[PDB]
């Protein structure tokens, strides 16, 4: 039998009620004797596609419905098999969200949407427009408080604003979404981000604000507002803030259009426990007690289960959540969604940090929102390995331990194949020599700013000063400005900018 056979392994994002779900798992373990293990790994959304297929990976995966279409398309999720008596217990529209090519590809759980969360003691009346925020912050600054603070590292949070005035993702054309019609480069979109960029220029927000930093700012009462979803209410209650939840601010007289997502559970197609996974989902989780339990840890939002939604239905927070949901649009689920998210995330972090003008970021964002991309076989907790698309820069390991820097000209066969070119003039071409490689012959050189440093002792491939070659090296320490101090093998110590210090594939063996 396969190693995964005989038990269940669940994956869920770290901001949901995985402890409340562990409870649902205990009731199940008890009734069947089978073991259930709940995990909340980092960047699970990117690891699932690389480990699920090797025939391994978790048995159940929880994420917003937007990424499920790509998994189903690639054959990583199995077609679920609920009868009609069960299909009736869920809201017909939540089933619509997890359908791909007329096939049900996952069990829906809840409808979640971002709302404006505010402090009542600090702000008895919240602004209705974004344009009131710049003045609201000047007023609040005199008392040592800020007006707004939310995650600027994840595009999902800024999207509501980028969409209010006309920005969209993919156009819903005939009976479908035209991937040839991206709307992240139109004036509607540019006007929203430009407004966001200005808020930062005028010191109303700092581009370093991430998720953790904002949550604390609001829970300690350092800021009057924040834009988050239902799952965040658990921590606020635990704190002191006397808060409220209402509609998002308008922009240019238009409502903020938050992308609406349906948390959903998928069943891995490689799994030998598809039938134990169904038992768990239909009889234990999607039950009044099963949801009530997960809802208790961290609020789920508007639940797909009709009978239990009758409870939260009257809750004002759910009311606001559904209000904003009705004003926004439901995320698509085509395979191009992950490429799309990588492009916008790249454009938002860049425009906000000055590294790129709004025009430049969004223009490129439109160029890579539909692009086919691949990922490197070598992964690292310190450096991203995707997405590798045309125009990307990488470290290539010639068949002929030196790695040369190359540009990517073509991604083919679903990202399992590339055609890279060395830009330095070669005997066969002054434009550069071209090679064909698979996923193990290269490492992605992240184009954006670095996020994590390498612990001292880490083996890496750094580009040597005045060369286009990456040589083996050992990390001594990281200089504050970010820069890595390194001892190069077979030669003072050498200082190389972090952007040129990649993980070692050899060490990763």
């Amino acid at each position: 039998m396969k190693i995964e056979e005989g038990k269940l392994v669940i994956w869920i994002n770290g901001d949901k009620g995985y402890n409340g779900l562990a409870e649902v798992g205990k009731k199940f373990e008890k009734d069947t004797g089978i073991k259930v293990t709940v995990e909340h790994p980092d960047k699970l959304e990117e690891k699932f596609p690389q480990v699920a297929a090797t025939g391994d990976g978790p048995d159940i995966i929880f994420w917003a419905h937007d990424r499920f279409g790509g998994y189903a398309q690639s054959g990583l999720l199995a077609e679920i098999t609920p009868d009609k008596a069960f299909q009736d217990k869920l809201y017909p529209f939540t089933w619509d969200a997890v359908r791909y090519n007329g096939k049900l590809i996952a069990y829906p759980i809840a409808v979640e949407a971002l709302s404006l969360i505010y402090n009542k003691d600090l702000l008895p009346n919240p602004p209705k427009t974004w344009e009131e925020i710049p003045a609201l912050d000047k007023e609040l600054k005199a008392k040592g408080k800020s007006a707004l603070m939310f995650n600027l590292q994840e595009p999902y949070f800024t999207w509501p604003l980028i969409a209010a005035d006309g920005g969209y993702a993919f156009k819903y054309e005939n009976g479908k979404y035209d991937i040839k019609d991206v709307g992240v480069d139109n004036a509607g979109a540019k006007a929203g981000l430009t407004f966001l960029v200005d808020l930062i220029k005028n010191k109303h927000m700092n581009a370093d604000t991430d998720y953790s930093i904002a949550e604390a700012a609001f829970n300690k009462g350092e800021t009057a507002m924040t834009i988050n979803g239902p799952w965040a209410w658990s921590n606020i209650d635990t704190s002191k803030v006397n808060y409220g939840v209402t509609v998002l601010p308008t922009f240019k007289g238009q409502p903020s259009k938050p992308f609406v997502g349906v948390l959903s559970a998928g069943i891995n197609a490689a799994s030998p426990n598809k039938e134990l996974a169904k038992e768990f989902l239909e009889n234990y989780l999607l039950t009044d007690e099963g949801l009530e339990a997960v809802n208790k840890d961290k609020p789920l939002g508007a639940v797909a289960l009709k009978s239990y939604e009758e409870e939260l239905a009257k809750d004002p927070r759910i009311a606001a959540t559904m209000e904003n949901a009705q004003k926004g649009e439901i995320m698509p689920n085509i395979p191009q969604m992950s490429a799309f998210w990588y492009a916008v995330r790249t454009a938002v972090i860049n425009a906000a940090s000055g590294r790129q003008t709004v025009d430049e970021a969004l223009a490129a964002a439109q160029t890579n929102a539909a692009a086919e991309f691949g990922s490197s076989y070598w992964t690292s907790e310190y450096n991203p390995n995707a997405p590798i698309l045309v125009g990307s820069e990488v470290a290539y390991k010639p068949r002929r331990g030196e790695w040369i820097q190359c540009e990517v000209l073509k991604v083919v066969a679903d990202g399992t194949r590339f055609e890279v070119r060395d830009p330095e003039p070669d005997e066969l071409g002054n434009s550069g020599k071209v090679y064909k490689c698979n996923r193990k012959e290269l490492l992605l050189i992240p184009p954006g700013f670095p996020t994590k440093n390498y612990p001292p002792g880490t083996k890496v491939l750094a580009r040597y000063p005045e060369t286009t070659t990456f040589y083996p090296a050992i990390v001594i320490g990281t200089k504050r400005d970010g820069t890595c101090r390194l001892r190069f093998d077979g030669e003072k110590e050498t200082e190389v900018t972090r952007r040129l210090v990649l993980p070692s594939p050899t060490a990763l063996a």
């Binding site: 040369i404 820097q405 330095e424 005045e466 060369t467 070659t469 040589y471």
Partner: peptide, 5 residues
């Protein structure tokens, strides 16, 4: 590619 030494 450009090399060392």
């Amino acid at each position: 590619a450009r090399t060392k030494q």
